[PDB]
Design a protein around this ligand. Sequence first.
Ligand SMILES: O=C(Nc1cc(Nc2ccc3c(c2)OCc2ccc(OCCN4CCOCC4)cc2C3=O)ccc1F)c1ccccc1
Ligand SMILES: CCCCCCCCO[C@@H]1O[C@H](CO)[C@@H](O)[C@H](O)[C@H]1O
Ligand SMILES: CCCCCCCCO[C@@H]1O[C@H](CO)[C@@H](O)[C@H](O)[C@H]1O
Length: 339
Amino acid sequence: RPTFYRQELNKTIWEVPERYQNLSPVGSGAYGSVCAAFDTKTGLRVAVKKLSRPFQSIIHAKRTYRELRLLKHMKHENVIGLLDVFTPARSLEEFNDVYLVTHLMGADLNNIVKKLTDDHVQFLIYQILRGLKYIHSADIIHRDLKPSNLAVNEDCELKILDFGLARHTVATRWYRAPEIMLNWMHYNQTVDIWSVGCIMAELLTGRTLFPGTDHIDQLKLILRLVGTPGAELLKKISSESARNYIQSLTQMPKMNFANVFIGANPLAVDLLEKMLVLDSDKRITAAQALAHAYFAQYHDPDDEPVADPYDQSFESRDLLIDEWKSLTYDEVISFVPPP
Ligand SMILES: O=C(Nc1cc(Nc2ccc3c(c2)OCc2ccc(OCCN4CCOCC4)cc2C3=O)ccc1F)c1ccccc1
Ligand SMILES: CCCCCCCCO[C@@H]1O[C@H](CO)[C@@H](O)[C@H](O)[C@H]1O
Ligand SMILES: CCCCCCCCO[C@@H]1O[C@H](CO)[C@@H](O)[C@H](O)[C@H]1O
């Protein structure tokens, strides 16, 4: 067991092993805060996330376990990976803090918002899709893919995060598939493809594709581009609510993408058409997307791995805070560094 040292940073205390030196806030947002640090053991710059109030409620407790489980499972170059997980706690009894350690990338994608070259886009989107392929094959939907959940280093290497930064040391709806806002019962994986579509579009135009002021506005903007649902899509809408609002709207046609994405690489345009289909069953999957001609210079089908099966059974479990806590504690304890 390493030696820990305390340190007040933000308004919070960081009790980290000395192994990690020179902590400095990158900022924070939803569910914790992150410090850049130096890993004296690997010589590598790392990001250290301290979970905020990891066991506040059953919900936080479960969210903390879910993140630890997710992270411990993600073993892919385009997906945030766990270098280390530790807690000051010597025992389950005093376990109330969780620090997750990952590679410091140094930037996220709204950090290039203030138009990329087609080659940069191409490379970034490839990497997103490559990470998504992997994520999706573990039966995991990200559901919140947006620029801030995409960490990029100086080499333009990208890892998908689920904890984006909000405070650095301005809207989530802009990337969400339309179904997520019609509050659909069950989302499929290609909700994430839609967000990629939005992300790609934004990288090529330097403009937020659907900068909806709200969920109604958002949906209005989406339909403006992709046109109202055809009766084939309508057929699949159980929500009499949704179905009502939908077929009452302006019957917009699908725009010509080649015209909206003027002078974009027509390969990119074609991928965007594939990604930004309202009907999620008809959206290109991340795997299919990796094959698309747009990524010919990056696509390698023998190096686009899928994940080991991810045991998501816990998600349906309703447990006591101390059970989530103790399950998280077991996860912290069972953790084995990458080689
Ligand atoms: O990804 C999940 N959990 C999870 C997320 C993170 N999140 C990270 C990590 C890294 C980074 C980051 C967010 O934000 C983007 C960013 C922005 C700026 C920056 O450096 C800018 C400041 N520099 C410092 C050095 O150079 C001079 C100034 C670095 C980074 C960065 O590198 C960290 C650990 C986790 F554990 C998850 C997964 C599943 C479920 C729930 C959450
Ligand atoms: C490492 C990158 C993978 C991204 C984490 C995917 C999270 C998938 O897990 C999901 O999280 C949702 C919100 O996060 C919850 O509402 C869902 O119940 C849960 O299934
Ligand atoms: C104007 C609102 C139109 C939005 C239509 C969203 C349709 C997304 O696609 C739908 O996803 C469902 C699961 O999420 C699937 O079960 C359906 O097969 C698929 O049609």
